[PDB]
What we know:
2 copies of one chain form a homodimer.
Chain A: E1 25-27, E2 29-30, H1 32-41, H2 49-70, E3 84-89, E4 94-99, H3 106-111, E5 115-116, H4 120-130, E6 153-161, E7 168-172, E8 176-181, E9 191-198, H5 208-218, E10 226-231, E11 240-244, H6 265-271, E12 280-284, E13 294-298, E14 318-322, E15 325-328, E16 343-348, H7 367-382, H8 386-407, H9 412-416, E17 420-423, E18 430-432, H10 433-437, E19 446-451, H11 455-459, H12 465-470, E20 475-477, H13 482-487, E21 491-492, E22 495-499, H14 509-518, H15 521-529, H16 559-566, H17 573-576, H18 599-606, H19 612-627, H20 637-644
Parallel strand pairs in A: 3-10, 14-16, 19-20, 19-22
Antiparallel strand pairs in A: 3-4, 4-9, 6-7, 6-9, 7-8, 10-11, 12-13, 13-16, 14-15, 17-18, 17-20, 21-22
The structure holds phosphoaminophosphonic acid-adenylate ester (2 copies).
One phosphoaminophosphonic acid-adenylate ester binds at residues 41, 44-46, 48-49, 87, 89-92, 100-101, 107-109, 130-136, 182 of chain B.
GO molecular function (chain A): ATP binding; ATP hydrolysis activity; ATP-dependent protein folding chaperone; unfolded protein binding
InterPro entries (chain A): HATPase_C_sf, Heat_shock_protein_90_CS, HSP90_C, Hsp90_fam, Hsp90_N, Ribosomal_Su5_D2-typ_SF
Keywords (chain A): Acetylation, ATP-binding, Calcium, Chaperone, Disulfide bond, Endoplasmic reticulum, Glycoprotein, Hydrolase, Hydroxylation, Nucleotide-binding, Phosphoprotein, Sarcoplasmic reticulum, Signal
Amino acid sequence: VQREEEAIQLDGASQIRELREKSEKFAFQAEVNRMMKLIINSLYKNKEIFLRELISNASDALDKIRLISLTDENALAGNEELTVKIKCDKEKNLLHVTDTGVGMTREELVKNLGTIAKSGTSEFLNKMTEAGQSTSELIGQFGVGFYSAFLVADKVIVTSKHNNDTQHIWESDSNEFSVIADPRGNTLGRGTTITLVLKEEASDYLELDTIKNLVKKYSQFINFPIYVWSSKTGGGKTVWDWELMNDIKPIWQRPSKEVEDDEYKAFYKSFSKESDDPMAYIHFTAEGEVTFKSILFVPTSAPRGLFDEYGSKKSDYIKLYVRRVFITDDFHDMMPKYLNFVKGVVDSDDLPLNVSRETLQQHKLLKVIRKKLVRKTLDMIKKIADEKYNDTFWKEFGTNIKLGVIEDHSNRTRLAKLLRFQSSHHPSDITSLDQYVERMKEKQDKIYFMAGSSRKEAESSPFVERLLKKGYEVIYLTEPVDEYCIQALPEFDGKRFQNVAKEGVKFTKESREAIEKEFEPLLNWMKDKALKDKIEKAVVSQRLTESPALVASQYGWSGNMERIMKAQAYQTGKDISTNYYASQKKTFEINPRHPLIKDMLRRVKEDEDDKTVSDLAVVLFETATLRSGYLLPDTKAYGDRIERMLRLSL
Amino acid sequence: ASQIRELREKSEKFAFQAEVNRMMKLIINSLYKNKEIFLRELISNASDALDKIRLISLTDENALAGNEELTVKIKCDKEKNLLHVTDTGVGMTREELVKNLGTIAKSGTSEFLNKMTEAQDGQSTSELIGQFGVGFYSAFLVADKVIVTSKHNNDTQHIWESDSNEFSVIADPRGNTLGRGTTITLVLKEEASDYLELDTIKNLVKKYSQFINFPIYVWSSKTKTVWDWELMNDIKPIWQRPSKEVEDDEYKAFYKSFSKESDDPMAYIHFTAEGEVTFKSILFVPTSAPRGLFDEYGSKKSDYIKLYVRRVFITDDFHDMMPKYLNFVKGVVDSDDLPLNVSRETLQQHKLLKVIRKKLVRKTLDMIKKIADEKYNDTFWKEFGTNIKLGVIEDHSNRTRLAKLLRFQSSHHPSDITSLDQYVERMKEKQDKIYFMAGSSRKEAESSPFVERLLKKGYEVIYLTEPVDEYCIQALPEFDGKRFQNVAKEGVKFESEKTKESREAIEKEFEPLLNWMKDKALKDKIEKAVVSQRLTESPCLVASQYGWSGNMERIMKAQAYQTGKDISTNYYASQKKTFEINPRHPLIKDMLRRVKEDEDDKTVSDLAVVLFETATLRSGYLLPDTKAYGDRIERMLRLSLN
Ligand SMILES: Nc1ncnc2c1ncn2[C@@H]1O[C@H](COP(=O)(O)OP(=O)(O)NP(=O)(O)O)[C@@H](O)[C@H]1O
Ligand SMILES: Nc1ncnc2c1ncn2[C@@H]1O[C@H](COP(=O)(O)OP(=O)(O)NP(=O)(O)O)[C@@H](O)[C@H]1O
C-alpha cells in the first residue's frame, strides 16, 4: 500500500565478437572541389533560381540590420533606405543585385561566402533566439544558396560594406576566391553588391523583361522594396528609372480586421490578375502541425479554360509561400480536382523545405494542409448567402460541387447540402435537398427524381405522372453529370433517392390487386406479340395518369444514363461493342383510359393473327421508347411506318 | 569584368572550405524524397566494388586468391534489428575506410574510372556507377548507426562504425573473417521497421537492381520450409546485345518476364539511339488492351516504360518522353551517358527529355507501321485504335504518319474496315472529296437519308461509329490532297448536264412550296428550305459547314464536364437546320397540291410538322419536344378506330 521510494527505468548493437571497445574516433571531412561541382552541375533543375536566392540573401541582409537598428541608434546613419536594387548591363555582360543590408566584414566575406553549408543567417538566428523578436523573416538555412549563382555566370564579383569595417571586393570562379580591399572609398554606404559575369548561354538574364518576370515569379512578398533599372519609353523617348516590382502588400500577415472589405478585393484583383471583384473570400489561420495561415478566393465567373483537360491540367490559382518566398503552384495533393477554381495564397514560416526550395521535404505534411484548406473552402462556400448562391454561384461552379460528391468521400455529406437542382415545385427556380425533404409528405421516405436531356423532356415525362397528380415533388436533372452525383449519394437526411424511370416506386389497394389479376391476358400476348428479348414484363402501371412506359431495373441503366455512356469518347474498340449494347431489359407498363384498354383488346379478343393489330401494337411500343428517352434502334423502321401511314391518311 | 576601375589588382587567394556537419545534415534531411533509395546506393556501391576487383583480375593473376565468387548477399535480422549488405568486391584498406567513407563528395569509383580513361582501358568505363561521393550517406535515412566491415587484399580487416557526427576505425579482433569484400550493417531506426521484413526488401532490390550485372542474393524462405539464398536479378540485359546476335524468342521471353505478362507481345522493336543522347531501347506493344487504359486518362503516368542509367533503375515517369496516346507502349530504356541529378531519380538536363521523346515516338510509330496489314486490322486496331485517333488530335508533328494508320468502316464492305489510302485509291477521277457519315452505330449511319443518292451514284461513304471519330476527322485538314466532307452538312456538289439546269426550273415549281414551310411549320424551328439535289427514295435536314451534325450534338449534350452556364447558353443547342425537300417523293408532290387547295389548310400544315419532326429523327438530331410528337402520332393511330 505505502509506496516505496524505488524508481524504475524506461529504456537502454552486437556482432558475435568477444567484447566491444573504443578506438580512434574521427571527424568527417569533405572534398570541396567535387562538392562545389555537385551543387553547380547536379543539384537544381531550373537555373533561374539564382535570382531567387540572391534576393533572399539580400532580404536577410536587410532584415538583419533592421533588427540591429532596434537596439542601436547609429546603425543606418546616412542611408536609412532598406532596398534591393537590380540592374542589368548588356554592354558589359553583367547583372547586379544590390542591397543596403548589414553587409559583410572581411572575415565574413571569407568565412560565410567561402564555406559550403555555412549560414551566417542561421547563426544570426541562433543569437537572436538566445537574446516580439521577429526572426521569422529570415529565409536562409542551408549554406549553399549563394553558390547557385554559379549556374549562369563564370565569375562572381561581390562588393560588401559592413559597419566598422572597410569596403572589400570578393571575386571568385567557383574554384578559388580573391579577397581585396576596395581601392575606391566606401562607394556603398552600407550593404552588398553581387555582380555576375554571365555566360554566353545565359544571355537571357541580360534582357529586362526576363528579370522583371523572374523577380515577380519568386520574390514579390519578401517584405522589402525591390527595384529594377527599367525603361518607360514615355515623355516620346526612352527614360530609365528604378521600377518597383513587389507592389502587392501581404494582407495575410495582418490579423483579422485590421484591414476591411475593400483591400481584399483589391488584393484579389492584383494577385490573381483579375479585373472583377471576387465572389467571396476567406481569411484564416490554421495552427498545429502545419501552421501556415492563408487566404482563399472564389472567382465571380468560371475561368475560360476550366474543365479543359480536366485532372491533367494543374491549376496555378493557388501559390505556396514559405517565409514570404514562392515555392510552388502545384497543389495536386493539397487541393482536390473539383476545387480547381479556388484561387489564393498559402504562406508559412516553419514549413520544412527541400534544398531545391520548390517542394516540401515532408510528404506527410501535404494532406494535413489539404484537410484545412478544403474544410475552410467548404465553410466559405456554405457561408455564401442563399440568394447569391443560386443566382450567381451555382451557374458558375455547380458542376464542380457535383463532381465533389462523386470524388470526395469524406465531404460527401457536407457537399450534398450544397447541391442545387430544378424541381416540380417551381417551373424554373432551383432548390436544395434540404428544401426537398422539408416539403416531403409523411411516410414518403423517398426523394423522387427524373433525369433527361432538358427540363421540358423531363417535366413532360410519362413517369411520375400520377406522382405529380398526387402532389409528390420531383427533382429534374438536366445536365449529364447530375445522375452520377445522385447515384454516388446513398442517403440524405434519412431519405433514399429514387429514380422515377426505374422500378421501386410504390403507392382498396388489395381490392385493386384483384383488378390487376383481371388484367392478366393482355400482358401474356405482349411477350408473344413482343419479339424474343423485346420486353421482359408487360404489367400494368399504377403510377400512370394520361399517357399510353419503359421502366428500367433497380440496377439497370436509365434512358438518360444510357445516352451519356454511349456518347462518351475515351473507350476501347473492344469495350464499345459490348455491355449488352442497346437492349438491356425493356419492361413495358400501361394504364387504361384509351386504346391501351379495350380498343387493343377487341382485336386481341377477335384474332391474335391479324396484321393490322400487330402493326398498331408495334408502333405503340416504338414511340414509347422515345417517350421514355431511349435510343431508337432503327430510324427507318419507325420512320417508314410514318411515311406509309400518312400516304393513305392524307 | 571591368568596374569603373582600370586597376584590377591581385591580393590573397583562398581555397573554398566546408562545414561538414551541416552539409551532412543537408544530405540526411533535405535532399532525397524517398528514403528507400539507401538499398539502391549500397547495391550500386557493392556492384562497383565487384567490377573493380574484376578489372584488376584481368591484369593481375593473384587478385582473386581463392575467392573467385563475385556476388552480393543481403540478410536482415528481425530479432536484432539489423540489415546486412555483403559483397565480395575489391573492399577497402584502412586508409580507404577513412578517406572514402569519411570524406563527403569523394568518390573512389570516380578516381578508379579516371585512371582507366587516362590510358587507352575503355572496357568497363560504362560499368561503373558512382560519380558523386554522397550515396553511402543515404544509409542514415533508415539507420542511426552504420557498421561497415571491409577486407582489402594486402591489408588487415577493419571495422568502420558511425552515426552522422563521428566515425571510428579499428582492426577486427575476429581477424580475416571475410575472404575479401565488405559488409554494410545497418542498425535500423524504429520508423524503418519495414526494411526488416524480407519481402519488403525482396521487392525493393527487384525494383531498382534488376540488371546490376552481378548476382544478388537475399536470405529468404522457400518451401518443410527451409532457408537459402535466392537470386533476385535473373532478367538479362538483352538490349546490350546487338540486333543481329539476339534471339527472337528471347524478346518474347524478356517481355513476359520484365513486364509480368502471361501472353506474348503483339510486336517489338530494338534500336540504338545516338547523337545528342545515347541509349539502347526495346519497346513493346501488348497483345491485348490493358484494362483501365483510359480510366485515369491524362494526369496519369504509366509505369510501363522504365529508365535505366548504367543498368540501374532511374524512373518510370515518362510524361515528357512519351505522349498520352501511347500509354500502352511498354519496354525499357537504358543509357550509360545520360547525366543524372544527385537524387538519381531524374535526368539533369531537362532539354534532353525532348530529344529522347522524339526518338521513342519515331521508333514506336515505325514499329506500328511495320505490322503486317493482315494482322493489323484484326488485332492492333481492335485494341489500340482509339489511341491512334487521339494521336491524330493531339500529336500535330506526326499527324500525317498517324493518319496512314487510321481505319474506318466503309460503304465498300458490310463489315470490313478500310485505310484512308485505300479510300483515295477507290475514289473517282473527279471526286477529290472524302464523304463520311457519323452516327450512334453503323445501322443508323448506313440507313441514313444523307447517303442515299451518294451510294446510288457510285460514291463511297465512310461510317463513323465511335464518338471520338468525328473529333479525329475534324483534326484532319486534308489527306493525300483530298479533303473530308460531311454528308450531313452543306458542301456536297453533285450532274452538270442539261438535266441539272432543268432542276433550276423545278426551283420555281417549289418556290411557293419552300416559303410555305418557313411560315406554316414553326418559323423558329426550321432555319431555311432548299431544293434537295441529293435525295433518293425518302420523304425528308442538313446543317451548315461550320455547324453541328446530329451526331456532334449528341456527344456535346452528354459531355458532363461543363459549367451550368455553358450548357444553358450554348447557341448550337438552339441552332436551327436547313430542311431539304426531295422532288420525286410522292408525299412531297401531293403537298403542293394541298396548300393551293387549302393554304392555311390545317391538314396541310399537320403533315409538314409531322414530316419535319420525322426528319429530325431520321437525322441524328434529338426531337425538341417528344410529347407533341407522341400525342399527334396517337391521333394518327386513330385511323384504325376512334
Ligand atoms: N547579400 C548579402 N549581404 C550580406 N550578407 C550576405 C549576403 N549574401 C550572403 N550573405 C551572408 O553569407 C552567408 C552565406 O549565404 P548562403 O551560402 O547563400 O547560405 P544562406 O544564406 O543560408 N542562403 P540558403 O543556402 O539558400 O539557405 C549568409 O548566411 C549571410 O550571412
Ligand atoms: N562496399 C564497398 N566496397 C568497396 N568500396 C566501397 C564500398 N562502399 C563504398 N566504397 C567506396 O567509398 C566511396 C564513397 O562512397 P559513395 O559516397 O557512395 O561514393 P559513390 O561511389 O560515388 N556513390 P554515389 O553517390 O551513388 O555516386 C566509393 O566511391 C567507393 O570507392
